[PDB]
Design a protein around this ligand. Structure first.
Ligand SMILES: Cc1cc2nc3c(=O)[nH]c(=O)nc-3n(C[C@H](O)[C@H](O)[C@H](O)COP(=O)(O)OP(=O)(O)OC[C@H]3O[C@@H](n4cnc5c(N)ncnc54)[C@H](O)[C@@H]3O)c2cc1C
Ligand SMILES: CCCCCCCCCCCCCCCC(=O)O
Length: 578
């Protein structure tokens, strides 16, 4: 009862650890996409104390809410700023792999876009309880659209928010659809509907609420925040899972204020259970540091091997991208133009916010196609059509320069871009360790254009040809001032292949590093129930768990694995046979 004791021990030491004295039945590593879902679900019933440990800040930024601000988000303090390893097969470089560092995670860094892919994508897995039939229902739990309400295929009621994009106000969007209608039999589609083929031109539905970003923080965690049940720790960087014959998860080592550690431990109640949600990048990284991974890889930096699972960090699927762009003949107007000059509009600030949301509702690349380049079982090619002209052959770093475009501006040249993605790529990469330091970046190699048969490079080369075909269509050629971006200089197949490879970039959909398998799956990391093989009380509920990357983008399937898993964990639902 002094004043120095009343301080240097009370207010200070009590405030030192926010986890001292407890006792949690769920500890979520990461406050990203799936984590947000899980926190909502496992905290709903009042009885189970749930803790989420996110390294980033919470999302309060206006740059998250307004979707056109995606550009400002890219090489920012809100991104993990991950760069890969020198890719020999990609002419030196060094590939940037955007990832969210934030509550809501990557769903807050998102290009929005709602894709489930194809029924076949899910059937192609090691299906012990995870067939297209099994997973459809959970897709629907959430949904909530302005595109039907019965559906089969589309629900309403759950917290996700999908809609057709509130900006359209173009004649370049119509120009694209007509150009696609020509250019060879491409029929219209309205995706996610597994009655439909999947291949075809159309609009992508956006993960937005009347033009505002509907990330998983906003939709799952924010309303459920301030439940006595739920402790959300922001700025908390996880170091490892604390483990144990029978390897047993005990909790999680973490650190507020980083490398100047003070290594705190979150403690598990007699129940379970630590569940990983750090993403396809950071989940395998953290597990390797927790001692769960390829032995020898773990031996290399002297960490005790628990489990020994060769699968962790392996089977990284990212779906790479390239680009054709072109300016318009004396038609200076949109989309660059529908919100620039060289300085931000004006009208568009009034259209977004208040006005029920106009252009700047964004993103770019809202609309496009799924295409079979060589009559594959499923479309190998994704086309993303932007009604703006790219100024770099790396689409990501075009966006970065677009954000860096204010007050210095002349005028953004004004035109169109077609981004070409290999949806269901054959090449794979890996996520490893670079040192014994859990605060070091995790050593990525995406392994683009790596497959034996050169299938990825092909699908992408044919994509360029497809794009040019479209550009030369009666409808588009009307608008276009020709000569493209790739260049009239790049004509041969070898010259296309040097261009892509010099220009290849990420369409930002990384999966599969802790893949779910069944029975005796030697390359798998988790079982049927998303367990983790060598360790009890530990699971992954995460993009990392995806056996084969599906067709479109990845958010939607992640917020589905999270739903289904949360249902499994809280009684409510089973997976497989008892
Ligand atoms: C630029 C970009 C655009 C995209 N566009 C689309 C799109 O248009 N449509 C679509 O469907 N999908 C899109 N995606 C994909 C989708 O956002 C992700 O696939 C999905 O969010 C992955 O969910 P996750 O559970 O892995 O969440 P993540 O958000 O990857 O969760 C990881 C979280 O864990 C935290 N974390 C990491 N390490 C630690 C640690 N050591 N301790 C504590 N916390 C940690 C991170 O801060 C992060 O918040 C895009 C992705 C990117 C990067
Ligand atoms: C809304 C800005 C429009 C003007 C800039 C031109 C568009 C750039 C080219 C399109 C490729 C898009 C790459 C983004 C990749 C991603 O979002 O994950």
């Amino acid at each position: 009862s002094a004043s120095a004791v009343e301080d240097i021990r009370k207010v200070l030491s009590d405030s030192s650890s926010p986890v001292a004295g407890q006792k949690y039945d769920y500890i979520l590593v990461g406050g990203g996409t799936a984590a947000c879902v899980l926190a909502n679900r496992l905290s709903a019933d009042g009885s189970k104390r749930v803790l989420v440990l996110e390294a980033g800040p919470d999302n309060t930024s206006r740059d998250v809410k307004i979707p056109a601000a995606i550009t400002r988000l890219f090489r920012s303090p809100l991104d993990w700023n991950l760069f890969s390893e020198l890719q020999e097969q990609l002419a030196e470089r060094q590939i940037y792999m955007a990832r969210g560092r934030l509550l809501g995670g990557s769903s807050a860094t998102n290009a929005t876009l709602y894709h489930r892919g194809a029924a076949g994508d899910y059937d192609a897995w090691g299906v012990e309880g995870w067939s297209s039939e099994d997973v459809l229902s959970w897709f629907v739990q959430a949904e909530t659209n302005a595109d039907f309400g019965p559906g089969a295929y589309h629900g309403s009621g759950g917290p996700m928010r999908v809609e057709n994009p509130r900006y359209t106000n173009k004649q370049l969007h119509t120009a694209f659809f007509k150009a696609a209608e020509e250019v060879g039999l491409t029929p219209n589609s309205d995706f996610n509907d597994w009655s439909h083929d999947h291949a075809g031109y159309g609009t992508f539905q956006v993960m937005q609420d009347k033009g505002t970003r509907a990330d998983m923080y906003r939709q799952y965690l924010k309303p459920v925040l301030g439940r006595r049940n739920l402790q959300v720790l922001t700025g908390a960087a996880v170091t490892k899972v604390n483990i144990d014959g029978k390897a047993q998860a005990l909790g999680v080592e973490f650190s507020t204020d980083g490398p100047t550690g003070e290594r705190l431990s979150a403690e598990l109640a007699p129940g379970g259970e630590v569940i990983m949600c750090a993403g396809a990048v950071h989940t395998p990284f953290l597990l390797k540091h927790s001692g769960v991974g390829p032995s020898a890889e773990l031996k290399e930096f002297g960490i005790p091997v628990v489990s020994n699972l060769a699968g962790v960090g392996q089977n990284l699927q990212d779906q790479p991208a390239c680009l054709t762009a072109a300016p318009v003949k004396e038609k200076y107007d949109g989309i660059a133009i529908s919100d620039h000059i060289g300085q931000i509009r004006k009208r568009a600030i009034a259209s977004y916010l208040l006005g029920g949301r106009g252009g700047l509702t964004s993103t770019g690349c809202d609309r496009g196609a799924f295409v079979r380049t060589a009559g594959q079982a499923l479309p190998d090619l994704q086309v993303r059509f932007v009604p703006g002209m790219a100024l770099d052959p790396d689409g990501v770093s075009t966006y970065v320069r677009f954000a860096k475009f204010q007050s210095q501006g002349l005028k953004w040249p004004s035109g169109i871009t077609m981004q070409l993605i290999a949806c269901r790529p054959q090449s794979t990469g890996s996520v490893g360790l670079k040192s014994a330091d859990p605060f070091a970046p995790p050593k990525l190699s995406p392994g683009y254009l790596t497959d034996k048969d050169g299938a990825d490079l092909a699908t992408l080369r044919k994509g360029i040809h497809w794009a040019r075909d479209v550009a030369r269509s009666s409808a588009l050629s009307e608008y276009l001032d020709g000569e493209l971006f790739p260049g009239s200089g790049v004509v041969s197949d070898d010259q296309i292949d040097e261009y892509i490879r010099r220009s290849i970039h990420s369409s930002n959909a990384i999966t599969g590093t802790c893949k779910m398998g069944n029975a005796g799956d030697s390359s798998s990391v988790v079982d049927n129930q998303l367990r983790v093989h060598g360790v009890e009380g530990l699971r992954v509920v995460d993009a990392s768990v995806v056996p084969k990357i599906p067709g479109g983008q990845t958010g939607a399937p992640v917020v589905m694995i999270a739903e289904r898993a949360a249902a499994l964990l809280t009684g409510k639902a089973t997976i497989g046979a008892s």
